């Protein structure tokens, strides 16, 4: 079927204007298309801000202003406000079904941009008696709050058996995300290092563990 | 005012069925329909189906049609949705949300209803202690942490030397591993701190009546 497309992430400040935007695979957005636009605020608070195009939802603020620019949907956000940091969805309708775009995180910048402060853990003892190994790798004090993890075992790419929680806001408003590698015991004692590295706005930190040294 | 209250979190085993129920309030609400909506991480969002409750007339989303059935009581001013056959998949949060013709979409949405669908058995957690294996040479401070495996279902509640020690603490979301919750937490103290003076991560479990209070010690001397 059709596939809705916006921005994935933007950053703005408070008092600035944001434009954030939507596109149709089929061809230019038209007032046929009936697009709308919603928030997510955490916990799963979801708030319908416009609909069809540009028709402002009850008791939302007139700084959001949806419209159409030339072949998309698009909604503008004049004078940003810090509370307006959260996902933005727009959905198009195509005759009888409503299809949603993959979601904008705006980040509306109430304090300077930080880097993740990284810590991995090894697996405890009391674990590997169980013959089970989890590496845990907690991310905090991150800002833009978007992370991608990439584990390494003896320099090699690992996919299998990695978790990782989506980021959440800290009571500093900064965030927070932990990942997960889990191994058998014997896995474990395979192999002599292991890494977690974190990328935020395009530069990584990395940390190391071998369990031969404290190198 | 407008308010759509769903009914609460639902856990159900693969194969079964369950229908919740979103009370709308505020409105008239002949005058409106109701549209479903499919969230999960990630994945982002699916629209289902929505009903008109004044005719009953149903429309889904083909990839939902087979599977769930959307209804209505006008007379309660509620609207129902039941899925059936259920598996791993339609574990999500499930919303709610007003159709009205004239805003051309969905002003309004519920607080969704979250779904668990699993074969698992109430297990308490087991807690594991994660000290450092190295010290930290540029390291003033130290991060203590606590790993909170295989339970379910959620939720835990974790504290440090029970409720005393609040700053500095990370305790983060739950993940799923092996079809069991996982999470951790962590709390950083200056150096000085530890292991002159004890820390305890107090982790409990109401599910299955458990509480296990573990000490951080430090690994044996190197």
Known sequence: ?215 | QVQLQQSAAELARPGASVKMSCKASGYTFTRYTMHWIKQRPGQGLEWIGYINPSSGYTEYNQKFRDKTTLTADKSSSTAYMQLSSLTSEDSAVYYCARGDYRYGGTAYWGQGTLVTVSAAKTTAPSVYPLAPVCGDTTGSSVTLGCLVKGYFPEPVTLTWNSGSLSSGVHTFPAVLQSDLYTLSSSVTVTSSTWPSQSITCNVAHPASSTKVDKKIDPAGPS
């Not at chain 1, 933007?10 to 230019?28: I, K």
């Not at chain 1, 159409?68 to 503008?76: F, M, N, Q, V, Y």
């Not at chain 1, 405890?124 to 390494?152: M, Q």
Request: with cysteine.
């Open chain 1, 1 to 215: 079927q059709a596939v809705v497309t916006q921005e994935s992430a933007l950053t703005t400040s408070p008092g600035e204007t944001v434009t954030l935007t939507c596109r149709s695979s089929t061809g230019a957005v038209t007032t046929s298309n009936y697009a709308n636009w919603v928030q997510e605020k955490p916990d799963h608070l979801f708030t319908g801000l416009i609909g069809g195009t540009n028709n402002r939802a009850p008791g939302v603020p007139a700084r959001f202003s949806g419209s159409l620019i030339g072949d998309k949907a698009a909604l503008t956000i004049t004078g940003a406000q810090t509370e307006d940091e959260a996902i933005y969805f727009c959905a198009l309708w195509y005759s009888n079904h409503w299809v949603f775009g993959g979601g904008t995180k705006l980040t509306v910048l109430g304090q300077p941009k930080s880097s993740p402060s990284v810590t991995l853990f090894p697996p405890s003892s009391e674990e590997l008696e169980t013959n089970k190994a989890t590496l845990v790798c907690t991310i905090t004090d991150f800002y833009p709050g978007v992370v991608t993890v990439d584990w390494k075992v003896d320099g090699t790419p690992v996919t299998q058996g990695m978790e990782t929680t989506q980021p959440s806001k800290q009571s500093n408003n900064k965030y927070m995300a932990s990942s997960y590698l889990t191994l058998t015991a014997r896995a474990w004692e395979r192999h002599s290092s292991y890494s977690c590295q974190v990328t935020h706005e395009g530069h990584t930190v990395e940390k190391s563990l071998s369990r031969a040294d404290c190198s």
